[PDB]
Design a protein around this ligand. Structure first.
Ligand SMILES: Nc1ncnc2c1ncn2[C@@H]1O[C@H](COP(=O)(O)OP(=O)(O)O)[C@@H](O)[C@H]1O
Ligand SMILES: Nc1ncnc2c1ncn2[C@@H]1O[C@H](COP(=O)(O)OP(=O)(O)O)[C@@H](O)[C@H]1O
Ligand SMILES: Nc1ncnc2c1ncn2[C@@H]1O[C@H](COP(=O)(O)OP(=O)(O)O)[C@@H](O)[C@H]1O
Lengths: 443, 136, 442, 436
DNA sequence: ACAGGATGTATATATCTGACACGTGCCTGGAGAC
């Protein structure tokens, strides 16, 4: 029916109203202390008061680190911006890594704005331009004004435009008998389609047929918009959407990342604070999630120390699975989790713990019942012993070949023989290393 | 991007199922009556009808008493009319609607007494074919 | 288009119970690996699960790339199969994660339903009105069939399609409304007055009858990466061919994912996942593996297949050694298929199939000698010797490869071990690792 | 103005000093560090005098001992219209600029030019608009009635003022501001008529407005280079401005200062984590400090006798000795327990957190035991644990619960070392299996 | 002091009349020249 991929049996942290966690709730099994700590972090994010609070999730492989961050994102809801990331993604070839980190910092602070629009709309009834006296004079356009007659439901208006608006109108290829939509905030013109007041079946260019727009031609409507700070920074750094030459040629050239200056961010902050002061906008801080944080080097860590101390930064969540490893970009610095001690001093570490046989067995039960598979009890116990012997993920990933081998024998139940056949056909890391060690020519 | 009729159709499940059987009902060459309850239950549906450019008229008692005299006459005389909208008690009381069989109830669940007169206006003497009642 | 290395493999050679035949569809031997690949093929064909990694490992010249070619051949049409090598990721205009993202998104196809109208008829009169500079174009087209006759209206691109492949009021054309394609089927009126400004020899077709306009439904498949590149900027369709798509932003991908889910909701489009095959995966950085570990957990992820032929080797970008050259966190979330080396009967059957593919007649003794030298040396060397021996036998004006031709080819063209021995016997004549060589022979 | 949630240094409003540059024990959100605060006050007076250029000051000490807080207090005490540039060390390793070019841009962003100018503005409340149009449209006549609370007048408009009033549509009852020379009309809002909302202006309609401008040297360098527009100040791709366009700016600024048309306002450039710069950057700084148009540079680092980047030897504070010869060093010391308690009380007061005395004693004890920053971070977590139990104040049990839930560095190191088989080490070895 | 049956409320509809609106034909007093 649907598609399942390594997750999506997790819907939330599954906590009570007082913060205590049920053992089996929300798709989670075990990890009670980590779930309660993540609930405290979720409440801290929902308080919307703090800036630059950073935690770190530490533990071994297959212990439930990224599942907790995904559960945090599901608990917060879609109105809070959540920016997933991998530590290898900060190494770009177009811009420096510091700018990529600051862009992903600004991408995690949302904004809700109740803005208003001025709209002229209706069906075009006439289109007559008036020429200039000296067309070849070098200065000034060919035309001077264009008379446009618009007709809507219980209304009719006549408009006199400059050549600037008419240039965008004729760029939209507007004829007589079309329904248009002029937005006065930017001069943008949208051609909705042919009107249905005329014949329909005599066209050859797959158009759509639109009724007459209701209400008057001139209108004022309120639109609720959800944007981030990075959207404003990008739209101001590379200007598009105006009717001038510079914003028109900006849509045609190839886009490229640029080092946004601090002055532009300060001006955008000033304008956004002015919008909030009028009661129009409202700030929604969010979460930045950097997975595999050991891939970063010392320069990004040293810039992260500076960037966490700013007065706008969101809540940062990191994850790592290294014991005591050298930091990348250095030679002698040995630190826990691959994170330097000055950054470790600014964190709050949440420990994650390994599982047992019972938790592995019920996790296999949950993953089997998510994937619409029916497993026998003896096969379930065999898979639980397999998971404790080798790996949890190897037992989880062997469910679908077992189901296929059961289906190819015209059967619905998964039995022990299917699990034995899947053991024979597919290997794991330890048996592959055993084959690699006793082999002739670098297998 | 302007609000899209399709997304308007597909975001409502009742209208989604309504658009399916109407295609084969038109392909059969038939006559359809649909009953309604709210204003906007019959203020959004003719947008869908004009999207399908179906021949339709709307009858309710908010309209004047003169129009009910000739709307029923134009329904019973013209065969090219396809869709006849209605409220509960506006035309389900004494109106001769023997030219159609398929009555479709959008939300007629108010009382069985009201619905028992509703198909009484259609399933009447003079019908020459089978009556298929669809309750949604 | 030419005779290639894996041109003799057409499928996997399996039954309905996924039991591999001993010799079928150009594949011999390797029953467990073929059965496992058939299970993976059924897993792709079901299309209900995402982000599963399969690793194919073994010694060199064993049939990993042959197995991947068999999987891609049995996968069928219109299902994407992206095959890349490990060294294509390192680019000068794209980061490694961006190139890996594009390679992941190229392997998911979107099948879109479309409604079109087909218009075929006989052209009566064309009127085209253009401005003085030729910018604005509009006009009316009068087309007809044997029963009906209609006057249409034309736009800019319809007029541009009519000006090319010039129609001369009596040609029979067919128009697709959604595609916008003009096809001139032929000439039916056969007019008398013809001026010498045209040199075509247009065919005599009949005037079509029946309905002028028909309704048709068409289905086409477009990958996710094409949709991203098209929606990225103004002229993205050229960048689909020139490769000038530099680091598409994440907002584009988020909005495309939401729009694709919306199209799936309305019944307009459906999702057909495919296979991404990364051959020679050991030539990848540690950052690529760290990206793959999180890219496999997404909703829109294909079935990733990797192949390698390394033992406990050094991982690139690190200073330690790992099994297969891959780190253990990636190996935890992968499923390993192991391939075995070949017998002599399998080698003889391989050589016979490759000889039949290259259209070479072989004797029994020549095949036995080729089997013996393919057992002693590698298999690929004895497979390469076949065409050379065929040319040598063709030089003597007989179309049958004999033992003397195989001996001559073995004499002329060397092996790896023979070349290593000849280098080590005369090491002063070659340039050493210290750059010393005796060029004088005295 | 200046939107912000809560910063890590938000409680500091400046250096706590009297008129004789002596530090109070607690003032303006700064606790302790008397000698460092006195030295920073001397440096602030040196910046305020403005007769001394190109002096380098190094702030060194252990981590989490008031180093960035001192520079934050200096930047607060500097006031407005004096440039302050704060960059990290790893921000100059760019892809489109060389390191010396980025350092030159950061140096020239901290020198300002103060220009005062005069202009004529008309700002009032629009009473009535009369616009008559001919059939041919050859000429436009008009009359504009505008008023303040003290005056009333009626104007006769020309053609282009009529065109500039039709554009940016002005109705009756609006409050607008008109520039005569440039022709720019700004709608300040709507006057108090209920039928955004701004009070009616007072006094004269025609007024003289003196505006004091402050332009950095970098802006003049960008503008005077004709290959780039002024949009490079916002997009950021100035792209290695040529050397010969800077001497013209220097000579012109010297000429303007001689003629009395402008004044030079020097500022402070602050480099945080200075140990991440290369040796070439230090060699460039050695000559860039000796210029006349050079600001006062404050650098901060916490390393001690480490390897200088780009070399293969070790040097004190990670800096070579020729740069340390050009600097005067301010040294910070570790904190006492009473100062830790006062700092934690100030941080709890900033976050409007009510603490019991026993909770404050527990936080002070665990701050002496582990870290100041860990005890600072625990307050906001324990507050949310307190709101989970539906009480306002923060008790001892909430602090103990937060201490149990969230670990520190030493406990995490202990848990890693006790179970190092389950983690990935430097050799890439791990044991994911539970049994055997 | 509590239960049970009355109205009260809400939140949509529905039909239907009441007291305003707007639109049109056509004459006599306003406009122009003197
Ligand atoms: N408590 C749990 N309940 C259910 N599934 C879990 C739990 N913990 C881990 N898993 C599963 O085990 C896998 C662990 O991978 P993940 O948590 O993403 O990163 P890591 O491998 O570093 O722990 C995930 O696929 C997740 O679905
Ligand atoms: N079972 C098989 N059927 C057909 N050809 C095979 C088979 N096994 C190997 N080959 C041949 O061997 C070569 C493939 O070897 P190779 O690509 O090196 O495998 P791998 O890359 O996995 O080591 C191809 O020339 C192929 O024709
Ligand atoms: N004298 C002080 N007064 C107020 N707060 C201080 C003082 N010293 C340190 N702090 C606080 O301690 C924390 C760490 O100090 P900081 O100077 O930022 O780090 P570092 O010393 O490593 O540069 C900051 O949040 C700061 O507010």
């Amino acid at each position: 029916v649907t598609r399942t991929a390594a997750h999506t049996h997790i819907k939330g942290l599954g906590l009570d109203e007082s913060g205590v966690a049920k053992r089996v709730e929300g798709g989670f099994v075990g990890q009670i202390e980590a779930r309660e700590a993540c609930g405290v972090i979720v409440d801290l994010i929902k308080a919307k008061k703090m800036s630059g609070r950073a935690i770190l999730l530490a533990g071994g492989p297959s212990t439930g680190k990224t599942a907790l961050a995904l559960a945090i994102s599901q608990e917060l809801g879609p109105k809070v911006p959540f920016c997933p990331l991998v530590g290898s993604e900060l190494y770009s070839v177009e811009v420096k890594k510091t700018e990529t980190l600051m862009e992903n910092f600004r991408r995690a602070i949302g904004l809700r704005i109740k803005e208003t629009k001025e709209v002229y709309e209706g069906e075009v009834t006439e289109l007559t331009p008036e020429d200039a006296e000296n067309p070849l004079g070098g200065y000034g356009k060919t035309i001077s004004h264009v008379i446009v007659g618009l007709k809507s439901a219980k209304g009719t208006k006549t408009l006199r435009l400059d050549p600037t608006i008419y240039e965008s109108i004729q760029r939209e290829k507007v004829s007589i008998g079309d329904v248009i939509y002029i937005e006065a905030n930017t001069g943008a013109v949208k051609r909705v389609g042919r009107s249905d007041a005329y014949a329909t079946e005599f066209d050859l260019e797959t158009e759509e047929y639109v009724p007459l727009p209701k209400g008057e031609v001139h209108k004022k409507k309120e639109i609720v918009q959800d944007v981030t700070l990075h959207d404003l920074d990008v739209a101001n750094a590379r200007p598009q959407g105006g009717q001038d030459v510079i914003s028109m040629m900006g849509q045609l050239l190839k886009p490229k990342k640029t080092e946004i200056t601090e002055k532009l961010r300060q001006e955008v902050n000033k304008v956004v604070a002015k919008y909030i002061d009028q009661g129009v906008a409202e700030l929604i801080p969010g979460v930045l999630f950097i997975d595999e944080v050991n891939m970063l080097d010392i320069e990004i860590f040293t810039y992260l120390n500076k960037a966490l101390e700013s007065n706008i930064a969101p809540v940062v969540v990191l994850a790592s699975n290294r014991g005591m490893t050298t930091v990348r970009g250095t030679e002698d610095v040995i630190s826990p989790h691959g994170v330097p001690p000055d950054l470790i001093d600014r964190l709050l570490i949440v420990r994650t713990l390994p599982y047992d046989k019972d938790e592995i067995r019920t996790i296999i039960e949950r993953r089997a019942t998510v994937e619409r598979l029916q497993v026998e009890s003896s096969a379930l116990d065999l898979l639980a012993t397999m998971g404790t012997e080798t790996s949890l993920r190897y037992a989880l990933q062997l469910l679908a070949p077992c189901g296929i081998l059961a289906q190819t024998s015209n059967r619905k139940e998964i039995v022990v023989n299917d699990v034995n056949e899947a053991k024979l056909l597919f290997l794991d890391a330890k048996r592959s290393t055993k084959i690699l060690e006793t082999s002739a020519n670098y297998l | 991007s302007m609000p899209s009729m399709d997304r308007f159709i597909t975001e409502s499940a009742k209208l989604r199922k309504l658009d399916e059987l109407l295609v084969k009902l038109k392909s059969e060459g038939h006559r359809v009556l649909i009953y309604f309850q709210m204003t906007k239950m019959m203020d959004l549906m003719e947008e869908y009808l004009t999207y399908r450019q179906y021949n339709h008229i709307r009858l309710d008692g908010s309209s004047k008493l003169e129009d009910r005299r000739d709307l029923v006459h134009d329904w019973q005389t013209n065969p090219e009319i396809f869709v006849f909208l209605l409220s509960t008690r506006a035309g389900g009381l004494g109106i001769n609607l023997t030219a159609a069989d398929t009555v479709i109830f959008y939300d007629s669940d108010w009382n069985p007494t009201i619905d028992s007169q509703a198909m009484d206006r259609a399933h009447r003497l003079g019908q020459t074919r089978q009556v298929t009642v669809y309750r949604l | 288009s030419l005779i290639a290395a894996h041109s003799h493999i057409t499928g996997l050679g399996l039954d309905e119970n996924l039991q591999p035949r001993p010799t079928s569809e150009g594949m011999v031997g390797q029953l467990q690996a073929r059965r496992a690949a058939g299970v993976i093929l059924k897993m792709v064909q079901n299309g209900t699960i995402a982000g599963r990694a399969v690793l194919v490992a073994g010694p060199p010249s064993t049939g990993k790339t042959a197995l991947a070619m068999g999987v891609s051949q049995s996968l069928g049409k219109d299902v994407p199969f992206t095959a890349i090598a490990g060294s294509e990721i390192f680019s000068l205009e794209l980061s490694k994660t961006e190139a890996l993202t594009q390679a992941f998104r190229k392997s998911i196809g979107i099948k879109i339903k479309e409604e079109t109208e087909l218009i075929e008829g006989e052209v009566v009169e064309i009127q085209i009105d253009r401005s003085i500079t030729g910018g604005h174009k509009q006009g009316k087209l009068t087309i007809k069939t044997t029963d009906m006759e209609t006057i249409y209206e034309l736009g800019n691109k319809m007029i541009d399609g009519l000006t090319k492949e010039k129609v001369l009021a009596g040609d029979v054309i067919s128009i697709d409304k959604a595609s916008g394609k003009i096809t001139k089927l032929g000439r039916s009126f056969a007019r008398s007055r013809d001026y010498d400004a045209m040199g075509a020899d247009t065919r005599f077709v009949q005037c079509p009858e029946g309905e002028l306009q028909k309704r048709k439904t068409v289905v086409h498949t477009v990958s996710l990466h094409e949709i991203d590149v098209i929606n990225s900027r103004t002229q993205g369709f050229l960048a689909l061919f020139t490769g000038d798509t530099g680091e598409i932003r994440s907002e584009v991908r988020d909005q495309i994912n939401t729009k694709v889910a919306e199209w799936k909701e309305e019944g307009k489009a459906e999702i057909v996942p495919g296979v991404l095959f990364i051959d020679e995966v050991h030539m990848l950085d540690i950052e690529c593996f760290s990206f793959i570990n999180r890219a496999l957990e997404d909703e829109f992820a294909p079935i990733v297949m990797m192949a390698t032929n390394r033992g406990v080797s050094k991982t690139r970008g690190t200073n330690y050694k790992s099994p297969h050259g891959l780190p253990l966190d990636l190996l935890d979330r992968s499923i390993i298929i192991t391939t075995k080396s070949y017998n002599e009967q399998e080698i003889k059957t391989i050589l016979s199939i490759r000889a039949q593919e290259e259209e070479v007649e072989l004797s029994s003794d020549a095949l036995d000698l080729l089997t013996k030298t393919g057992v002693e040396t590698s298999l690929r060397y004895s497979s390469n010797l076949i065409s050379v021996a065929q040319q040598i036998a063709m030089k003597r004006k007989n179309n049958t490869v004999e033992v003397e031709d195989v001996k001559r080819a073995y004499l002329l063209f060397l092996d790896s071990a023979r070349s290593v021995k000849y280098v080590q016997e005369n090491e002063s004549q070659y340039i050493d690792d210290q750059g010393n060589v005796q060029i004088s022979i005295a």
